[PDB]
Design an enzyme around this catalytic site. Sequence first.
Site, PDB file in Angstrom:
ATOM      1  CB  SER A  46      -0.954  -0.014   1.021  1.00  0.00           C
ATOM      2  OG  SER A  46      -1.979  -1.213   1.170  1.00  0.00           O
ATOM      3  CD  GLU A 145      -5.107  -8.232  -9.116  1.00  0.00           C
ATOM      4  OE1 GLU A 145      -6.001  -9.332  -9.184  1.00  0.00           O
ATOM      5  OE2 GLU A 145      -5.558  -7.113  -9.303  1.00  0.00           O
TER       6      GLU A 145
HETATM    7  C1  LIG Z   1      -2.335  -2.097   1.687  1.00  0.00           C
HETATM    8  O1  LIG Z   1      -1.270  -2.819   1.604  1.00  0.00           O
HETATM    9  N1  LIG Z   1      -3.506  -2.792   2.141  1.00  0.00           N
HETATM   10  C2  LIG Z   1      -4.636  -2.096   2.403  1.00  0.00           C
HETATM   11  C3  LIG Z   1      -5.052  -2.164   4.021  1.00  0.00           C
HETATM   12  N2  LIG Z   1      -4.405  -1.099   5.043  1.00  0.00           N
HETATM   13  O2  LIG Z   1      -3.081  -0.511   4.594  1.00  0.00           O
HETATM   14  S1  LIG Z   1      -2.145  -0.634   5.483  1.00  0.00           S
HETATM   15  O3  LIG Z   1      -2.272   0.291   6.694  1.00  0.00           O
HETATM   16  O4  LIG Z   1      -0.861  -0.061   4.720  1.00  0.00           O
HETATM   17  O5  LIG Z   1      -1.903  -2.069   5.933  1.00  0.00           O
HETATM   18  C4  LIG Z   1      -4.728  -3.543   4.643  1.00  0.00           C
HETATM   19  C5  LIG Z   1      -4.566  -4.626   3.501  1.00  0.00           C
HETATM   20  C6  LIG Z   1      -3.463  -4.362   2.332  1.00  0.00           C
HETATM   21  C7  LIG Z   1      -3.741  -5.071   1.216  1.00  0.00           C
HETATM   22  O6  LIG Z   1      -4.648  -4.809   0.366  1.00  0.00           O
HETATM   23  N3  LIG Z   1      -3.361  -5.993   1.160  1.00  0.00           N
HETATM   24  O7  LIG Z   1      -3.667  -7.354   0.334  1.00  0.00           O
HETATM   25  C8  LIG Z   1      -3.713  -8.631   0.918  1.00  0.00           C
HETATM   26  C9  LIG Z   1      -4.204  -9.830  -0.045  1.00  0.00           C
HETATM   27  N4  LIG Z   1      -4.216  -9.001  -1.443  1.00  0.00           N
END
Ligand SMILES: *C(=O)N1C[C@H](NOS(=O)(=O)O)CC[C@H]1C(=O)NOCCN
Lengths: 267, 267
Positions: A46, A145
């Site tokens: 992210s 993805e």
């Molecule tokens: C980003 O990497 N995210 C979005 C969300 N929160 O952002 S964070 O505070 O940077 O962790 C948590 C999930 C994450 C994802 O989208 N990860 O995907 C997991 C399976 N595709």
Amino acid sequence: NKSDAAAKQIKKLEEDFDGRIGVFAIDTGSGNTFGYRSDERFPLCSSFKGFLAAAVLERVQQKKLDINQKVKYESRDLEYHSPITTKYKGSGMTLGDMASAALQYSDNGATNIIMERFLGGPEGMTKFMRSIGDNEFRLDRWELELNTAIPGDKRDTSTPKAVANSLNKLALGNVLNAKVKAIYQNWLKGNTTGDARIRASVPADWVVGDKTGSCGAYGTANDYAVIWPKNRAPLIVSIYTTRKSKDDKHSDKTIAEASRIAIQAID
Amino acid sequence: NKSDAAAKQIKKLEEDFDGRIGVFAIDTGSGNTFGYRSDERFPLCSSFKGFLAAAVLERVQQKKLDINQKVKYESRDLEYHSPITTKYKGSGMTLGDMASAALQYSDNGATNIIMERFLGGPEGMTKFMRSIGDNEFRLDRWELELNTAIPGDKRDTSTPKAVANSLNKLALGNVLNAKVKAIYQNWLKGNTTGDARIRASVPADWVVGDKTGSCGAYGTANDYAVIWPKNRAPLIVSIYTTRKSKDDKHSDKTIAEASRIAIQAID
Ligand SMILES: *C(=O)N1C[C@H](NOS(=O)(=O)O)CC[C@H]1C(=O)NOCCN
Ligand SMILES: *C(=O)N1C[C@H](NOS(=O)(=O)O)CC[C@H]1C(=O)NOCCN
Ligand SMILES: [Cl-]
Ligand SMILES: [Cl-]
Ligand SMILES: [Cl-]
Ligand SMILES: [Cl-]
Ligand SMILES: [Cl-]
Ligand SMILES: [Cl-]
Ligand SMILES: [Cl-]
């Protein structure tokens, strides 16, 4: 010796949790830097969303987009983890609100909408980074993805140093004009997802803007930050981590501790 | 560090009631200021009505409207909390009387009528603020939807600093001519909703003009004021608050206390 001592500490920390830590830090006052695996590739997760928001603001400043234009998506099947876009689906959001949602809440719908309509997809995101002289960053895929974090996979990666340099150029340098830069800074300062990371490594009364990433595979997580210490020139800190096994969970504490180490190294 | 001491006090106060406090204060005689979260966004609620009234007065001064022209609305379904417009529905009101009702009684019918007919809606209200150099204020919705105060929502927000700066320009500066400015000052001085807030933080014999906001959700409430201390140059005080939970009630005492702290900080 101070650099070698810090490197020893990061190395131990990465061994302690069976993983890999990449660090780059800059004291923008003295020019002093510290790097550890600072040229190796790590998944962005992210964290790229912080740069996406900057790309939007550049377009705004070039008058190619208006920060207040309405972005409608009434018919869209919103991606997983779209807490902000979900709430405003009926009314729409301003371009500014959508971009800041992508950054401050990691809203995936906000992210994909912006890439589809305004930024030219992952290719266009990469071209923006090339435009500021960042030769390492690459975004290859869409949410979600892009978050596979497969060991050895070059897709959707950058390096700690390239991330730190880009953040420096965008948050502190010349890419954005004074007015739009202040908006970008405020967006970073209002990030909601980074309280256990770089923010946890400095005193309560230092001002921090950051963006995190948490891929959710291979214990892969990260944080980058601009830190304004009380009465001092700002610092830039970039921390990327991976872990050996697919099912390993990320370690906020490792990130925070690596940040503490980096900040001392440049002190 | 008088600023640092005051900041510590506001921070404690916001922690005491599990919420967020934004402050900006100006001593117009020295130019000294004090700010806390002064660039963060807070819902305007009814406080925007103080600026709506100024917008009407500007139109009057530009001869685009007459302060005494009759505003009729005999067929209108009046919005909730229209105590003044309700009483004159049969006969109509003068533009001036309607605008002062919007300010002093938070009359929602007065507010919507003026925005529909004379100000060009929320967009036109925002354009007015832009015209005086206020780049933060944004009004997105009509009464009463503008009052939702949803955490993270940027609709219908401003910042404490921008509110204070704008109130300075309008109540004390050059936007309105001497004659029309005196009318605006009198309107503010006659506000009826602010007795437990900024007014409660200064001696009985200081003269105060103010406008409050009380969204009625998320303990969201505010006040801005021009204060004429006995024998001294005027002060400007802007206090905005939110709370964590939907059902939290606003805290007049917290507002009054934050005002006391801000006034000391600039003295
Ligand atoms: C980003 O990497 N995210 C979005 C969300 N929160 O952002 S964070 O505070 O940077 O962790 C948590 C999930 C994450 C994802 O989208 N990860 O995907 C997991 C399976 N595709
Ligand atoms: C101004 O701030 N308000 C708040 C009002 N919502 O609060 S509630 O009535 O308690 O739910 C909506 C519009 C406007 C007013 O009408 N203010 O006067 C209402 C009583 N303070
Ligand atoms: Cl946001
Ligand atoms: Cl990945
Ligand atoms: Cl706090
Ligand atoms: Cl007139
Ligand atoms: Cl009408
Ligand atoms: Cl309407
Ligand atoms: Cl609101």
